[PDB]
Ligand binder design. Sequence first.
Ligand SMILES: CNC(=O)c1cc(C(=O)NC2CC2)cc([C@@H](C)c2ccccc2)n1
Length: 112
Amino acid sequence: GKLSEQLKHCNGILKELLSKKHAAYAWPFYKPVDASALGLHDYHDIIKHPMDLSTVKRKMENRDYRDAQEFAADVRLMFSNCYKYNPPDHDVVAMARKLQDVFEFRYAKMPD
Ligand SMILES: CNC(=O)c1cc(C(=O)NC2CC2)cc([C@@H](C)c2ccccc2)n1
């Protein structure tokens, strides 16, 4: 389905976040947190709105996002979930900060 200019910029960012370029730090955000598999039995008590890049991709493919702000809200929800659940010295927080730096700097170049 035909995306607005801003949603094409969003789709471009999404492809970059999923690309081999960022795989060393992006991989924990590829798929929903499998709380049971990881032994994180408190995850769904602490995180009320799980989010990950596969869900963002499905919503982009389904034309769920009506504007760039709605897309950005889900990407930032994903990072916020990471910062809320994890102690700030866990490697996954370092990885979140690096992927969010990629996101924020390219999101800022949104066409007007
Ligand atoms: C989005 N993923 C997560 O929040 C997450 C959390 C935790 C975790 O055990 N956290 C406990 C609270 C301290 C572990 C992991 C895994 C996938 C992992 C391992 C090593 C490096 C990067 C990731 N991801």
